[PDB]
From a paper:
Hypothesizing that a serpin reflecting a highly conserved sequence may offer insight into the delicate balance between folding and function, we designed conserpin (consensus serpin). To design conserpin we used the consensus approach and a previously reported MSA of 219 serpin sequences. Conserpin (396 aa) shares the highest similarity with α1-AT (137 residue differences; 62% sequence identity). Characterization of its function, structure and folding reveal a serpin that is inhibitory, folds reversibly, is thermostable and resistant to polymerisation.
Author numbering: -4 to 316, 330 to 361
Amino acid sequence: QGAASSHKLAEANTDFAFSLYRELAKSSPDKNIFFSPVSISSALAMLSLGAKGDTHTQILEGLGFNSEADIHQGFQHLLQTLNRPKGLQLKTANGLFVDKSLKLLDSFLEDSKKLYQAEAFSVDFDPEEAKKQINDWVEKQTNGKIKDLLKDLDSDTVLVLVNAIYFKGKWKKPFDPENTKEEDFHVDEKTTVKVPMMSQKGKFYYYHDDELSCKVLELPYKGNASMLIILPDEGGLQHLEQSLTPETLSKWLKSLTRRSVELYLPKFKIEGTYDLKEVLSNLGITDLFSPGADLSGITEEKLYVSKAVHKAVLEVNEEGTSPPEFKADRPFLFLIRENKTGSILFMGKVVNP
């Protein structure tokens, strides 16, 4: 239909981010969430290079696109824009591991390299030595921050998708460590957890959303990205999540004003690990992850995605470079977005810091 616009990309991806948050939140409640919805969108987009028929349809439509949409040069442009050196410098592992007895079409290897900067490997799939080789590659690609990604590996495995990312960003406005004090984080009515509370009093873009009974605060990162922290009022989190949509976000963006805030933010490390087959099953991307998948653009041989893992890790600390109180001493949501593109890089929920 002609390559889709950057604006189409920004809209399809952002609706995919939120819909994916909403499924994760419904699936595993009361657990820490952290994923990179743009990493996932890109990996599915990459795989769609080699998908045909309903397999191809289910991917695009699940990504937020018309069935006949042409998305590749748009994704290519978006990615090179995120990966600019004035960016976050996210080192990420994105690998495709396929049975070595299968001959891969050249058009796929070239097109996934150039467009998506994604690496494909033909591999012998002995359950043990293969998991070693793959986990070791992710380790290298992520500078050792993500070890042992794969837990186990079935002998009849034909195709493994691996998507891993570790993020530790630098604040535009850094907390002074001297202000950091142990405080109670109230996980729920009956659970308390002791946490280093970072504190800072300054000017931040802030909004108190009465409609949704939550506060919203923006923390700028070094590298033209920002964390939007959403703190619900007492006993409101679930309703806040139900009302968590692209239209709410933009409403929040127009509504933030630069205000003097007293800010209390815990230093924390969270993690998400996801099986893309069960996570995407409700988003309607099913055929791809089962024996009758049409991946005849990848190989003429019968083929499907046997295993697909996304893992994302986030460290938050103090480094480095009437008034309202924003005290995050109970579960809260956040997302990290790219300023230039509006891209939702990460989304998360801190329940157990």
